[PDB]
Symmetry: C3
Subunit: 416 residues, 3 copies
């Protein structure tokens, strides 16, 4: 074989009923043909698996345990299942289409057990031993979790962002992975990648999923670029933990994730030049000694949800949280724009001054030239007693920077 | 069928004479085979249409009225038709190539009627009713308008930037569209997309077209990233109207569009980190209550046209226009570099001080740490009487910031 | 033919033994079939050459002398050959894979002569005469130089970063070229492009090569975006000379190149919003009248090498060099973050204060709002006597900005 596979032209199995069995069957063939690891300076180059545009049901989890496997399609096929499930059911046979399309993988797996959301993943990338599994590519296909289900919260089942399904789950240490041009829709978790080195997530459309991008465990020298991201109110849009040298740029993050970016103990990383829009506070969270990070030239918009099916759904956080919350040392917050739109009548807790940037802990945080435009009075910067020895420049007037001048360097934005 | 089409292997029609008829014939086949919208949790996944590298004439407009249609090629095939048409005609048979290449669609349509430039579009994406037409992809092919024609302006016909031809025209509301890796050349309009939600224009080469990117009507949460853009002096390089949450980054915009970026009533968007180069003033225009936008870390160069066929062609605007013109409220202009190269002898109007940043209207505009390097004296910032209550920091000395100190906060850049 | 070629389905030659002969044979066929340059408004559209995933040996240099040639694969196949060659040899038969994969081109060429590293290039793009060779595309395949060899330096042969092999070498003036989604590994030079106009290097993985990206001779309006880059200590990560309008963004440059970015006489370009990490000083060098450049919102980390096989390897430069060295006029250094981790016991020369930003020559350089976090005392900015008339704002306290106040405008970062 020439290492080129098409799921519609594989003899064993049929991809309409179960594309999981088909791809696993292909992976078996690749391992059979690529047994030896050092023959003429080569051995296991891997292979490419092609999904033509189509509606493929996946009933078996795809296990990927080989390096250099590309899975490509010919279309991300996103349509807004959220909108359609909220359209009256009578009007459905008049709609031009109902379901997502492209090269579509329908995740027909049940929810996973105790700490086993991995068991409900369409694609599981896992391997033990050395070296790190490397250069697996997912390109330009659709992954659909189809329906959200009742969570006992009382809301309409299709608006819970709950089904125990994952698009792609990478369990093992990985080097040089790529997720590009994908479409993820209607999954509790779109993309969960543990232990990622030199990972690239470029130019995906990841929307109407509970959580979109979670980089878990740890990682190094990775980048999340040029994505369109929208999550649900109990989940993360972009999340990373214990990462170093992460680059988060050029993303357009829209609602309705709890956060837009959420870092737990992330260091020496850069969250710069993204468009961020949420309907709740707590848009960007640097937590648990997230230190020496650059947060720069981003555009923040926080406003009220206008779409009436989610009117009065929130993420549990009040306006004193801040749009940018920082618990950690020596970060750099430079050149950001913040737009705060809130109605004075509905500011929680009653009658507080909403806060934009908040330093809850740590020291040496540099905050310079940030511009806040708000329809109400705001605390541009709020430095808790738990944080000290911070420099805060041109980010508000003396009224707008609430902080103890004894232990912090402040310059007020000139006025009048 | 497996929803995979190749224009060179379609029985009905021949793509050398008319690829328009061929693709429309394919679209008819897709609609025939994908009638039902809800069969086994699916129905109309769409399809992919492949253009091998070749010279294809298009004589019929391609109408796209289905979601999830990908049209892909294998090469953007840009060569500079402008350069070649200005090379002496005697030398033409010595040139290695003459025409553009790649997967080439030659637009052989006549110009459109009154308000109907849409009729001269090679690709028309239009549909009525719900939902929004979604996830149409144009990838890695060439669209050539072949020749520019006489406009009665007296200039050489091939330098008018005038033929009534459009590359791609999207008329209807659309969600999750993509234009990637394309080559557009020698069209009056390269890419015109009305009413665009979550649109992505990543990594295209869009040059020697009258106007390149126009986002018209309205739109939300879209992004124009990583493009190489060059327009003509009566047209737009990047234009958007009535957009929210637009992200314009990582573009290299070269001459010779009138503007590099032009916003009409665009809000809460970000034009950051682009390289911008024009031969005229008015490089970036925020007009008609373009408000709460971030303009950051861009590199502006304005200089004289050196290429002698366009020597003394301009866009009608004088040096008092400004490089960055702002008419709107609460924008953020941070960290930009401006290089102004003009000859003192040819500054229009005679003997004026050229202006870099200009605030013609609105209030609350924040302008901090911008650096201007000019071979002459310049008005780094000019605040008209019509604009007030702006903050202007470290963007010039007191001489260089022309503004009424009573109603604006100014800090001069320290000196000497 | 339809201009579509597959290296595994070409009759003349076999790509396992010599893919160079196969591709050159294909190029001969394309020139044979595309003789005429103006037939029905077309002539030489070019072609696409496909490499399925596989282990292909290249023994003949591929000469590309036609416009619009795409060479595509289906996988970048990077694995870390550096790690594996430093793993004990006994453990090798237990490793899951050894070699890189994807669509793999193994460079089996010997080293080149005097000033002829071009002779050891797998892919040579060269043409004389007009117009500029245009829109050649390299996409999503692997280029492997296989082994590094003894350089007489005493270090292990596989750690010398020395074999005289180049991945892709472009010798001639070129317009609208693309290198996207590639994997380069174990080459002395990954990508060397002379005389490049409107070049795009988007989304490549270029690691464990002596030098990765060199833009040589001259060039205009090009961009290096969204790459993962790692070089060797005698070479360049990103290098450009005599370029204008270069855009370097969204890159994650990791060790162990001498520099992360190195400019020789580069003007009116932008190095903004990259993550930069080196184990040595001299991370970003603007040299030989590199002027009017924007260096903005980047994240710099300099620390000690932790990997014991390269412990005590360096690039020859001392801590007085600076992380950002500037020799040229009117540059803009805005919004950068710098993390300096050094052990006081090993600061060369003995007991000096390490410098972060250094201005060795030129005038009018604007340096505003830069934040330095260091485990030791540092010279945040050092202005040599050879540089004067610079503005330096909020980039350190008066102690931390070493400069002559008579001929430079300084504002200290407020304190305490
Ligand atoms: O809020 C975004 C979030 O909601 C979803 C599901 O509805 O899309 C909503 C959507 O519309 C919102 O924004 C438009 C413009 O502000 C507004 O008219 C509408 O009322 C809002 O619901 O948001 C995007 C653009 O931001 C639109 O494409 C979409 O219709 C979901 O897809 C997303 O996660
Ligand atoms: O000015 C760009 C504009 O003109 C076109 C058509 O000529 O390309 C011109 C071009 O050259 C210009 O820039 C070079 C370098 O400054 C200069 O030598 C020449 O005189 C200029 O015309 O511009 C790009 C680079 O900016 C070159 O590739 C090209 O030759 C057109 O393509 C473009 O819209
Ligand atoms: O230093 C990067 C440079 O080295 C190479 C070859 O070893 O990769 C090294 C690598 O690990 C380094 O970083 C990790 C995390 O800091 C550390 O544990 C290890 O000791 C270091 O060698 O660097 C990248 C991430 O930066 C890892 O993927 C890789 O293991 C080479 O690939 C690169 O040019």
């Amino acid at each position: 074989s020439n290492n080129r596979y098409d799921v519609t032209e594989w003899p064993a199995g049929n991809p309409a009923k179960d594309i999981g069995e088909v791809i696993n069957s292909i992976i078996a063939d690749i391992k059979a043909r690529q047994g030896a690891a050092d023959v003429d300076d080569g051995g296991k180059p891997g292979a490419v698996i092609y999904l033509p545009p189509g509606d493929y049901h996946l009933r078996t989890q795809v296990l990927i345990d080989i390096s250099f496997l590309r899975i490509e399609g010919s279309g991300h096929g996103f349509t807004s299942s959220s909108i359609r499930f909220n359209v009256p059911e009578e009007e459905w046979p008049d709609l031009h289409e109902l379901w997502p399309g492209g090269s579509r993988v329908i995740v027909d797996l049940p929810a996973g057990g105790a700490g086993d959301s991995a068991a409900g993943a369409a694609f599981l990338v896992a391997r033990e031993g050395s070296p790190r599994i490397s250069s697996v590519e997912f390109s330009n296909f659709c992954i659909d979790g189809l329906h959200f289900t009742a969570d006992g919260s009382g809301r309409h089942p299709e608006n819970t962002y709950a089904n125990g399904k994952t698009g792609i789950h990478v369990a093992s240490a990985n080097d040089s992975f790529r997720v590009t041009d994908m479409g993820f829709v209607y999954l509790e978790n779109a993309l969960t990648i543990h232990k990622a080195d030199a990972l690239s997530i470029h130019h995906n459309f990841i929307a109407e999923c509970g959580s979109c991008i979670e980089l878990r465990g740890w990682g190094q020298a990775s980048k999340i670029t040029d994505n369109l991201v929208g999550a649900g109110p109990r989940g993360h849009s972009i999340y990373a933990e214990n990462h170093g040298g992460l680059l988060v740029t050029a993303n357009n993050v829209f609602p309705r994730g709890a956060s837009s970016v959420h870092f737990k103990g992330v260091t020496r990383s850069s969250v710069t030049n993204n468009r961020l829009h949420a309907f709740y506070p707590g848009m960007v969270r640097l937590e648990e000694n997230s230190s020496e990070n650059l947060v720069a030239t981003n555009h923040f918009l926080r406003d009220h949800e206008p779409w009436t099916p989610f009117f009065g759904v929130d993420n549990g956080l009040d306006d004193l949280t801040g749009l940018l919350s920082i618990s950690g040392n020596n970060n750099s917050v430079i050149g950001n724009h913040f737009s705060e739109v809130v109605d004075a009548n509905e500011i929680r807790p009653e009658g507080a001054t909403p806060v934009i940037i908040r330093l809850t802990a740590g020291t040496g945080n540099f905050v310079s030239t940030n511009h806040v435009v708000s329809n109400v009075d705001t605390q541009h910067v709020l430095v808790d007693p738990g944080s000290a020895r911070n420099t805060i420049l041109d980010s508000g007037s003396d009224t707008q920077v609430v902080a103890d001048r004894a232990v912090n360097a402040i310059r007020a934005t000139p006025t009048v």
